[PDB]
Amino acid sequence: KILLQCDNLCKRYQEGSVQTDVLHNVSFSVGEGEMMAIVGSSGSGKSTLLHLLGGLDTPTSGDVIFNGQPMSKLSSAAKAELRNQKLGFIYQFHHLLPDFTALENVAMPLLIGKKKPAEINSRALEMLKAVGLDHRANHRPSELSGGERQRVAIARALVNNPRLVLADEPTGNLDARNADSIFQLLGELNRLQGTAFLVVTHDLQLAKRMSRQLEMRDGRLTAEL
Amino acid sequence: KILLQCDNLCKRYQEGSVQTDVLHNVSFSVGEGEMMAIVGSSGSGKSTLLHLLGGLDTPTSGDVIFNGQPMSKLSSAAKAELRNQKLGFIYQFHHLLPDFTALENVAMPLLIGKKKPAEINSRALEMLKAVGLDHRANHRPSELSGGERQRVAIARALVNNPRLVLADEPTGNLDARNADSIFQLLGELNRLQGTAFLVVTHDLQLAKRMSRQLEMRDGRLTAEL
Amino acid sequence: YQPVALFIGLRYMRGRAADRFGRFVSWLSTIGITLGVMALVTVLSVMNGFERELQNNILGLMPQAILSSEHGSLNPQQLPETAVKLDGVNRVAPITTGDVVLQSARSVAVGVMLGIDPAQKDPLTPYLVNVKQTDLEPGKYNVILGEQLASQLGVNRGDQIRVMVPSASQFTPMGRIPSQRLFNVIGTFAANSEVDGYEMLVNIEDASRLMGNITGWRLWLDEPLKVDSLSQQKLPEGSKWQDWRDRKGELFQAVRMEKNMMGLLLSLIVAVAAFNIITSLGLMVMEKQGEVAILQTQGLTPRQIMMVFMVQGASAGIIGAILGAALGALLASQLNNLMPIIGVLLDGAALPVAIEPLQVIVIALVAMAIALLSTLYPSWRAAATQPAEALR
Amino acid sequence: CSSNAKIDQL
Amino acid sequence: PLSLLIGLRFSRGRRRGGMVSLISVISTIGIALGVAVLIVGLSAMNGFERELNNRILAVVPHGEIEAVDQPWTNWQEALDHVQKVPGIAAAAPYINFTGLVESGANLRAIQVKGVNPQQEQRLSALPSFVQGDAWRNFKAGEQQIIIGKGVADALKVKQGDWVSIMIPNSNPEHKLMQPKRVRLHVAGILQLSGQLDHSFAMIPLADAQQYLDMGSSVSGIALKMTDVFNANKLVRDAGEVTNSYVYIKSWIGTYGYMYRDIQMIRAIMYLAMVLVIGVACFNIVSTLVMAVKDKSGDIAVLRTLGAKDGLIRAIFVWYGLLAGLFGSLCGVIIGVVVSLQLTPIIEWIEKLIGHQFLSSDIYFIDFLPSELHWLDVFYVLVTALLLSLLASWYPARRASNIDPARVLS
Ligand SMILES: *C[C@@H](COC(=O)CCCCCCCCCCCCCCC)OC(=O)CCCCCCCCCCCCCCC
Ligand SMILES: *C(=O)CCCCCCCCCCCCCCC
């Protein structure tokens, strides 16, 4: 009963012609349906932690055991379709495609994996009804407000039944009154199909809403500090 | 007696159906060796004000007289000699040339003024010696860290004895411990050579090290509005 | 470090990418002008070889220009060989011309009379097939027919023909009768050309035309490509300039019109390559908008910042025209020297080449001109814009 | 065009 | 029915910037400068081959069987042997006369031949280019003559004028007695393409026997063949039935050099336009590598959404083809309005410079034709797209190796 097993994933980064160990001896266990939170300073390495568990960076020391399959043994094309229906990525820098509309942006994982054309406009427009942006589906995100376009990327990866969503500051560029609207929606997916997600922010206010409370400061922790 | 006498700088750039003013009735006074500071909200006109004292734009209402010479009567070629050894510009968006190294980047104002080659290999490296980047002279700024390459542009314009060091957010994207060490180096040029400078920022806590702590709220400054 | 303040900030803008493909993208403007010159000098070199061999078999066997008088014949005692010192003339020989018509026992033919002096050197003397030049004696009226002329007339050696002059005819009051005498043949010469079918060698002293004098003087030129250029010089009085443009004025003029059509079609390679400079430098300014405002704040006039982007559009034209002319002249000279590399053509005529040194200099200055005028528009957009109102 | 030889065959 | 490899990248090309609106204009002009001139370039090459079969090949006989300096007293039985050859259509005798014309104090080279006017319309298209109203007045016994268009400019005579030509005497002994001049009246002139206007004349066969003072004897035998690409084998076997050996010739040694010069342009102009489109496809490389570094944030988004290597590589392949297809199809629209209307175009330039080109003295024709073929339009379309696909394949491989974790995602 384990989703992701992380042990001794020391990531080295070239900082001034020297592979410095920004992370070392990290141990993080992900459970099925567990509510966890990751807090830390801006520079400890909590932003690049999602790239090691996702598959964007190379595990030069150790291996991430996701569902009993190590990603180090997989090839480059073998890690492509794994990150489509099993993992998700939510950022805070508003990484949305400005060429497409709001309806075709959330249907982008449904088009890569060669799904059915009848399933395209059947699992993408219903996600905008849960957030409350179905009336602005045929609009451009460049002419919207600050907090309206940020809610599009929250339900972007939640279209093909994910298992582990790697969030990174979801309450970044929207108001506090709309910040709890995406948090009450995330509590329903554990009662619908039983998925888990970890939230990586900096402040201590929204991190206490999860069940498991643990910090992450330079990869050094024993119980709590 | 005076360095720059600003008197009714009303400017209207592009915005609206009719052009609206972002600065109006600005009566500023710059003295030789005095310390000033400008604070305000990002978008009120605190960043667009600095283009008028240096001479980059046409004010079209009022006259800017720097050291007894109005810039409206001088041509574009005459302002190039004025903006070489009398004023300096420091920004925050990391506008450095990536094709050159760190040693040849600070020697760029020393080459347009048609100086001797003896001043190129002497006055350039002594500025990275004071800021602490002499061992990173023959390096590329594209492979540096976040706070290392930001200190190159601070000592870039201080190579040909400036008089009015116009600074636009010097504490932009570097460490706070490194933020005031270059301010102590800025605070020593008054007793060796003698120069004036103003620090434009958006916080009052980093502007308390100056003498005349002023502000800029939509171009309406009387004392502390 | 350079003492010039303009060329110092451009040596690192061409090799900023140390990649196997990133360096090839920035050097795409050099290959477009290099391949455009070497596809122009090499193709025009074999077109000049066709014009070189055409003059050696047609213009090298006929008199180019004759200095005749305007009142008919020319007295040799009034105009000697010492007062004909003109430009381009290296040898003066007496000669006569005129339209004549043949009359044999089988058929007639066409030709022009070509009276030469046997006491002087003639270029047709190696082409004489067992015929001596001393047989052309005055009073014997000996005619040396050509190879293709005597082949269709059926006149062998030791025969008798009749030459009539319809142009120089005696205007008798009783009617119109042409002057004609009896002429015998002595041999047949061959030169493997086209002028042998209408040119024969007769004596210079003849009474078939009017008046014992000559009509003009034969002159040789060093370059017969510029006969119209020296047609407006100072000529002596009592003379009329008569060149080869009256008969062959449409044959060698047809070769010059073909060079203006092939050379202009091959000039479209550097015309599109000149358009590549506008797109390679037009996109380079918009991705380096932050570096323009830095030089304006450090101190630089907008007149000198226009010259900065002019070097990037002129460095590909200078080194592209020299390397294109070096490889263009090497391909034309070594075309059929070692082995055929362009293909085995089914001609078998030993295709020559002619590389003119003056033609390389005028071609390379064209590629350095259209590459410079197309650079002024991307260079003006980087200077006419505002330094601070654009992005920062 | 301009490339002529005028060679016959009997 | 859009697929996954092309995607929906039509909206990616609608970018907004500074002077980028002018870069898209020159990118479709320079790539269409070598395509629109190649369609009209091969149109005039097909027009030169079309006019050769109607004004050059249809006016001269293919095979010529002459006599080696001997009068043929048994030429009647030789016409039956050449007619039954499997590959010879018709046959007609002809007599060559090498005479000149002397009328008006001039000198012109004319080649008059004696052909039967009743049998001249069965082997060549000779009386179909006469400026007169008819040609049936060429009977026997009234001394007819018909000249070309290039003879009347020097003689300044029209229809109904008596001219005097030079006719040689067929004396049995090699001697000269007097020249023969017979007064003949012309009954109209004929026009041809560019060569046989000043050196072509015809007389009837019954009016040619009285000039040589003979009976029924000809000199040469003309013929006409179906296939014209092989004119060297049909003449050799056709002359082995009359006598031992005669002088054989064809139209290859005197008029067959025009096919070598026409096909040489197609092996040069098509080879020269490879380098024209080859440097025009560098404009696609300069706008594809530039479109990678500024839009590198959107490439890292699709890698986090679970895209394979073949999907992120095929985006920039079809993106570079959009700038090439708009320029290649822009040359087809120009290529059909210049080729189909070339005759008002070439005549418009010749009346403003002062002097006209393509004179009818030593060239093929005086005008410039254009026969547009639809097979050459498909050949130039795939050639411009094959060079654009090779130019956009190498920046597509560089964009597939972008690290998504290096950029701030
Ligand atoms: C008689 C003809 C052809 O004459 C020749 O003999 C041509 C010369 C043969 C060239 C052989 C070259 C062999 C070596 C090649 C090496 C290539 C190297 C390349 C780099 C590696 O005379 C002619 O030339 C015919 C000219 C016909 C021109 C027709 C096209 C004109 C089109 C109009 C001009 C363009 C208008 C554009 C308007 C925008
Ligand atoms: C020798 O074979 C005689 C050839 C006579 C025709 C020569 C034509 C030369 C010019 C050809 C132009 C082709 C393109 C026309 C459209 C631009």
Side-chain angles (χ1 to χ4, degrees), chain A residues 1-11 13 15-16 20 22-28 30-33 35-52 54-62 64-168 170-174 176 179-191 193-215 217-225, chain B residues 1-215 217-225, chain C, chain D, chain E:
Chain A
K1 200 179 181 299
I2 183 73
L3 188 60
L4 177 146
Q5 184 65 39
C6 171
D7 50 343
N8 297 330
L9 273 295
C10 176
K11 179 61 179 181
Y13 199 84
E15 300 180 3
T20 70
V22 62
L23 277 74
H24 48 274
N25 313 77
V26 56
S27 198
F28 193 66
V30 190
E32 298 96 347
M35 295 303 185
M36 302 170 301
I38 290 297
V39 78
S41 63
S42 159
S44 87
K46 65 179 195 306
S47 87
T48 179
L49 187 56
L50 310 183
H51 306 151
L52 274 296
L56 299 182
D57 269 299
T58 43
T60 174
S61 45
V64 181
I65 315 300
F66 182 72
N67 211 19
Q69 295 90 20
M71 57 179 54
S72 316
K73 300 179 180 180
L74 304 178
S75 66
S76 192
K79 298 188 298 297
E81 77 290 331
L82 186 60
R83 306 168 305 187
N84 190 27
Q85 71 270 358
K86 305 289 185 177
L87 309 97
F89 292 92
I90 293 178
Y91 295 96
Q92 64 160 344
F93 302 100
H94 194 63
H95 282 290
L96 285 181
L97 274 81
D99 307 330
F100 292 91
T101 180
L103 177 49
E104 296 174 347
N105 212 333
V106 304
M108 199 61 61
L110 299 180
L111 291 169
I112 299 176
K114 299 183 299 300
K115 291 298 182 299
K116 304 319 296 173
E119 288 180 331
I120 299 303
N121 209 284
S122 314
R123 290 147 55 185
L125 79 161
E126 59 177 9
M127 306 305 172
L128 304 177
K129 263 175 290 301
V131 188
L133 291 180
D134 61 321
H135 68 294
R136 306 299 286 269
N138 303 331
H139 283 256
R140 204 63 61 93
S142 168
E143 56 97 22
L144 300 183
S145 60
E148 191 181 323
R149 55 184 163 90
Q150 198 68 33
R151 309 172 66 180
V152 178
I154 313 300
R156 179 185 61 178
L158 307 176
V159 286
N160 47 1
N161 211 322
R163 302 277 95 179
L164 166 56
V165 185
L166 301 181
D168 194 340
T171 75
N173 190 263
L174 74 158
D180 48 301
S181 45
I182 58 183
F183 280 150
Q184 61 209 12
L185 209 168
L186 278 166
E188 200 42 64
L189 273 304
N190 211 344
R191 287 165 271 181
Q193 67 248 27
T195 180
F197 64 99
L198 54 97
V199 178
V200 183
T201 72
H202 180 75
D203 53 309
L204 319 179
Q205 177 48 83
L206 84 168
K208 306 305 162 273
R209 300 187 181 184
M210 322 297 288
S211 55
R212 183 174 179 181
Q213 294 299 316
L214 76 160
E215 54 95 22
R217 285 291 284 107
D218 305 73
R220 301 306 302 179
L221 75 161
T222 76
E224 182 70 33
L225 71 92
Chain B
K1 194 53 211 63
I2 211 67
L3 194 57
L4 176 145
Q5 205 41 66
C6 154
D7 190 315
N8 290 128
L9 269 290
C10 181
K11 192 49 199 284
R12 39 191 71 250
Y13 292 126
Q14 50 93 46
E15 58 266 349
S17 198
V18 72
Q19 41 184 358
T20 80
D21 59 337
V22 302
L23 276 301
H24 52 273
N25 309 124
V26 179
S27 278
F28 210 74
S29 198
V30 193
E32 301 100 337
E34 60 158 8
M35 310 312 177
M36 290 172 298
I38 295 299
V39 79
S41 87
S42 45
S44 45
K46 43 172 290 313
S47 183
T48 76
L49 167 58
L50 279 300
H51 306 152
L52 276 297
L53 309 98
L56 296 155
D57 300 322
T58 79
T60 200
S61 65
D63 207 354
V64 173
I65 37 184
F66 179 73
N67 214 337
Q69 291 95 27
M71 53 82 70
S72 45
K73 301 180 180 180
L74 313 178
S75 198
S76 88
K79 286 183 299 183
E81 185 68 28
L82 187 59
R83 290 168 305 184
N84 191 26
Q85 73 271 355
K86 308 287 186 177
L87 309 96
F89 287 87
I90 294 176
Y91 293 95
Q92 62 152 339
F93 299 97
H94 195 62
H95 287 283
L96 283 185
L97 275 81
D99 307 70
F100 290 90
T101 179
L103 182 60
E104 297 174 347
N105 212 332
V106 304
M108 198 61 61
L110 296 178
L111 288 174
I112 321 176
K114 294 170 293 300
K115 289 265 187 295
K116 294 300 110 183
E119 276 84 11
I120 307 298
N121 263 337
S122 43
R123 303 181 75 176
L125 81 170
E126 65 174 87
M127 296 306 300
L128 309 99
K129 178 65 169 56
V131 80
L133 293 178
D134 185 38
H135 56 104
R136 311 289 289 187
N138 299 331
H139 280 259
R140 202 65 60 91
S142 78
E143 55 97 22
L144 301 183
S145 44
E148 186 180 339
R149 53 186 162 90
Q150 202 71 29
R151 310 174 66 180
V152 178
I154 314 300
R156 183 189 61 176
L158 314 177
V159 301
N160 47 2
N161 192 56
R163 304 276 92 177
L164 176 46
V165 189
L166 300 178
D168 188 344
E169 184 47 271
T171 66
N173 305 330
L174 74 160
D175 188 20
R177 205 228 62 71
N178 284 117
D180 52 352
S181 46
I182 57 184
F183 280 158
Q184 299 142 30
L185 199 165
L186 196 49
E188 291 304 284
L189 318 180
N190 47 357
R191 59 198 67 176
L192 279 65
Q193 290 86 30
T195 184
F197 38 83
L198 51 96
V199 173
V200 171
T201 188
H202 53 81
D203 47 351
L204 197 161
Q205 306 277 79
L206 289 200
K208 67 191 300 179
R209 59 183 61 90
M210 318 302 287
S211 84
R212 231 175 65 181
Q213 310 174 18
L214 299 180
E215 48 90 17
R217 285 302 303 122
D218 303 358
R220 289 216 169 273
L221 155 71
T222 55
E224 218 71 34
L225 178 145
Chain C
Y1 281 158
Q2 297 180 0
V4 186
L6 276 297
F7 299 144
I8 182 58
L10 289 151
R11 300 268 82 87
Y12 296 95
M13 298 186 67
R14 305 179 64 92
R16 60 195 180 273
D19 210 1
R20 301 179 180 180
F21 188 66
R23 202 182 181 181
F24 195 77
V25 174
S26 87
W27 283 82
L28 278 181
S29 194
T30 312
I31 315 169
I33 322 175
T34 297
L35 291 176
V37 172
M38 71 175 301
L40 182 57
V41 192
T42 303
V43 188
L44 257 62
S45 282
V46 308
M47 298 186 63
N48 293 330
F50 284 147
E51 209 175 8
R52 192 266 305 276
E53 298 289 328
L54 203 63
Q55 286 193 141
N56 293 14
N57 293 124
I58 300 176
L59 280 183
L61 274 80
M62 74 183 299
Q64 293 93 359
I66 173 157
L67 189 59
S68 75
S69 87
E70 72 270 351
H71 53 81
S73 159
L74 191 147
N75 197 31
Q77 302 291 327
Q78 298 289 329
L79 275 77
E81 298 182 0
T82 70
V84 285
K85 299 296 166 294
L86 259 62
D87 184 29
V89 192
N90 59 329
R91 184 181 179 181
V92 173
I95 209 167
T96 178
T97 54
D99 273 337
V100 292
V101 59
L102 269 300
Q103 180 72 30
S104 177
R106 301 184 180 183
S107 69
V108 305
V110 78
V112 285
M113 198 180 61
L114 189 67
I116 212 67
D117 210 306
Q120 298 181 0
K121 191 181 298 180
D122 200 279
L124 298 180
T125 39
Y127 302 105
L128 295 172
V129 194
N130 59 88
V131 168
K132 298 295 295 301
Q133 212 186 8
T134 73
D135 303 358
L136 297 181
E137 300 179 359
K140 301 299 180 180
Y141 298 145
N142 292 12
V143 188
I144 308 175
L145 295 184
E147 190 57 72
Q148 269 71 67
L149 177 59
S151 279
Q152 53 100 9
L153 279 177
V155 181
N156 217 331
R157 50 179 73 252
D159 294 335
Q160 195 170 15
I161 55 176
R162 183 174 301 179
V163 193
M164 201 177 65
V165 187
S167 291
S169 159
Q170 305 289 330
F171 281 159
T172 78
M174 44 71 57
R176 290 182 176 271
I177 41 170
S179 51
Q180 47 183 1
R181 293 183 179 271
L182 273 300
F183 291 89
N184 46 1
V185 289
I186 47 179
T188 292
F189 81 108
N192 204 237
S193 164
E194 59 99 20
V195 306
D196 299 358
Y198 52 89
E199 283 184 358
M200 64 285 299
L201 293 180
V202 300
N203 204 73
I204 177 64
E205 181 71 32
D206 58 328
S208 60
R209 296 190 59 88
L210 78 161
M211 198 59 60
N213 47 0
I214 60 177
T215 68
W217 304 92
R218 181 181 185 179
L219 55 96
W220 284 263
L221 298 176
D222 291 331
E223 270 145 0
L225 308 189
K226 40 196 65 176
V227 195
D228 202 17
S229 88
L230 52 93
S231 198
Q232 286 88 6
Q233 64 189 356
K234 177 46 63 183
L235 271 80
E237 66 270 353
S239 60
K240 181 187 299 178
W241 181 261
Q242 292 185 358
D243 45 354
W244 50 269
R245 297 190 290 110
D246 55 354
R247 299 183 61 91
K248 292 299 179 181
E250 299 286 331
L251 176 61
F252 292 95
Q253 206 264 352
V255 189
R256 200 179 73 252
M257 206 265 297
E258 292 180 0
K259 298 186 300 179
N260 302 333
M261 296 301 180
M262 179 51 68
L264 199 141
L265 186 74
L266 295 160
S267 88
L268 304 182
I269 318 177
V270 293
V272 181
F275 288 153
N276 195 27
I277 302 169
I278 322 177
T279 60
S280 159
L281 295 184
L283 303 173
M284 201 178 185
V285 176
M286 296 186 307
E287 64 101 15
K288 285 183 176 300
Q289 284 265 32
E291 279 81 18
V292 187
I294 286 302
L295 307 179
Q296 297 287 144
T297 46
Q298 291 171 349
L300 182 56
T301 172
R303 194 63 177 182
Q304 279 181 3
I305 212 165
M306 191 182 179
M307 191 205 168
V308 179
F309 292 96
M310 286 294 298
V311 187
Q312 291 288 143
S315 198
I318 290 177
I319 209 66
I322 300 300
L323 187 46
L327 296 180
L330 191 146
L331 192 60
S333 87
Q334 308 291 139
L335 191 63
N336 50 2
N337 224 27
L338 273 80
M339 49 180 180
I341 48 184
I342 67 154
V344 194
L345 201 55
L346 295 177
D347 44 355
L351 173 64
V353 71
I355 303 178
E356 180 179 0
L358 199 59
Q359 210 181 14
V360 192
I361 318 178
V362 60
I363 279 176
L365 260 69
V366 171
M368 293 179 182
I370 55 179
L372 204 70
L373 271 298
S374 61
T375 323
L376 290 171
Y377 194 78
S379 279
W380 188 81
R381 296 301 301 179
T385 180
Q386 298 286 332
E389 311 276 309
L391 75 162
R392 272 307 107 185
Chain D
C1 215
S2 62
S3 301
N4 300 332
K6 312 299 172 192
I7 297 312
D8 55 352
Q9 183 204 280
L10 299 180
Chain E
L2 275 77
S3 65
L4 186 45
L5 298 180
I6 174 171
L8 273 79
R9 309 300 174 264
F10 186 74
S11 59
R12 196 174 293 270
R14 301 303 176 183
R15 76 275 190 191
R16 185 72 259 176
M19 54 175 299
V20 80
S21 165
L22 196 140
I23 313 295
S24 177
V25 174
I26 318 292
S27 199
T28 76
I29 284 299
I31 210 168
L33 192 146
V35 182
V37 80
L38 197 48
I39 303 177
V40 77
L42 264 74
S43 300
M45 293 298 115
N46 302 331
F48 287 150
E49 203 179 5
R50 186 189 60 179
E51 296 290 328
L52 197 143
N53 304 127
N54 304 329
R55 299 181 182 269
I56 291 296
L57 201 58
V59 304
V60 293
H62 304 84
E64 300 271 47
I65 301 180
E66 294 154 20
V68 282
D69 216 318
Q70 283 179 352
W72 273 353
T73 59
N74 49 330
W75 66 276
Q76 285 88 5
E77 55 98 19
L79 192 146
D80 301 331
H81 292 74
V82 63
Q83 200 74 29
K84 56 175 59 59
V85 177
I88 304 303
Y94 78 108
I95 304 177
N96 277 331
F97 280 152
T98 318
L100 297 183
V101 59
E102 288 292 281
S103 291
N106 45 0
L107 164 73
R108 294 278 94 182
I110 189 75
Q111 297 289 329
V112 54
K113 54 185 299 179
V115 78
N116 209 319
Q118 210 264 350
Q119 303 286 331
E120 66 176 2
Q121 56 179 352
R122 295 179 72 252
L123 78 160
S124 279
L126 280 179
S128 45
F129 292 96
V130 188
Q131 299 181 1
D133 56 352
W135 55 278
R136 275 90 48 90
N137 303 330
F138 290 150
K139 300 179 298 301
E142 68 270 355
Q143 308 293 137
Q144 287 292 328
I145 188 53
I146 168 166
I147 64 155
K149 198 181 181 300
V151 192
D153 51 27
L155 276 74
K156 282 86 61 173
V157 289
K158 284 307 294 303
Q159 190 260 353
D161 299 359
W162 292 78
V163 292
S164 198
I165 73 174
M166 300 299 300
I167 298 179
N169 301 330
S170 87
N171 222 32
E173 42 188 355
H174 295 346
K175 65 177 299 180
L176 269 301
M177 34 180 71
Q178 76 259 10
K180 187 175 183 179
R181 276 92 56 91
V182 185
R183 299 176 57 91
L184 311 178
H185 55 279
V186 64
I189 60 182
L190 60 97
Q191 59 90 29
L192 276 180
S193 45
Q195 195 71 30
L196 301 105
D197 288 322
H198 42 71
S199 87
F200 184 73
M202 281 186 302
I203 55 172
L205 196 59
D207 298 359
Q209 303 287 336
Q210 63 173 10
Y211 293 149
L212 297 184
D213 313 328
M214 303 193 313
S216 159
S217 189
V218 299
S219 65
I221 294 297
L223 55 96
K224 188 250 288 181
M225 53 186 61
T226 60
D227 48 329
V228 299
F229 293 100
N230 186 25
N232 288 16
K233 202 178 63 61
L234 300 180
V235 196
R236 173 82 265 186
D237 67 326
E240 299 287 331
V241 298
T242 76
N243 63 328
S244 87
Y245 186 75
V246 284
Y247 288 157
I248 43 174
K249 52 178 296 299
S250 75
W251 68 282
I252 310 297
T254 174
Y255 280 95
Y257 67 99
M258 300 179 179
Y259 275 106
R260 191 181 55 89
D261 293 331
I262 282 176
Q263 298 284 337
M264 202 174 60
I265 304 177
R266 294 194 179 100
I268 285 300
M269 187 187 298
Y270 187 77
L271 191 146
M273 287 302 145
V274 171
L275 304 180
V276 175
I277 305 169
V279 305
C281 298
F282 292 154
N283 212 330
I284 320 178
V285 186
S286 315
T287 192
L288 194 54
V289 183
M290 196 62 59
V292 160
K293 30 191 167 182
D294 55 350
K295 296 183 179 180
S296 278
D298 302 332
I299 314 177
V301 173
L302 302 178
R303 294 185 184 272
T304 54
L305 263 63
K308 298 183 175 300
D309 214 338
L311 180 60
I312 209 66
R313 196 178 181 179
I315 286 176
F316 298 100
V317 172
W318 267 268
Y319 182 74
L321 287 178
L322 289 180
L325 190 145
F326 191 77
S328 280
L329 285 185
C330 185
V332 194
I333 313 176
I334 311 296
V336 304
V337 304
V338 180
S339 301
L340 287 178
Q341 293 287 144
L342 201 59
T343 43
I345 287 178
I346 309 298
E347 292 180 357
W348 187 77
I349 317 176
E350 295 179 356
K351 63 182 298 180
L352 272 73
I353 305 299
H355 54 85
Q356 56 175 359
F357 43 84
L358 211 66
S359 87
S360 45
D361 215 318
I362 56 169
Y363 285 163
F364 192 79
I365 42 181
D366 45 27
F367 73 103
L368 189 55
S370 57
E371 187 184 13
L372 177 60
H373 286 177
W374 300 102
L375 195 60
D376 285 338
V377 185
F378 188 75
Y379 285 156
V380 76
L381 189 61
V382 187
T383 316
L385 291 181
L386 191 146
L387 297 180
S388 162
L389 191 146
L390 191 146
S392 61
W393 182 262
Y394 292 95
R397 198 177 59 91
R398 193 181 179 269
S400 88
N401 303 331
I402 304 178
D403 185 7
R406 183 58 180 89
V407 71
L408 308 190
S409 312

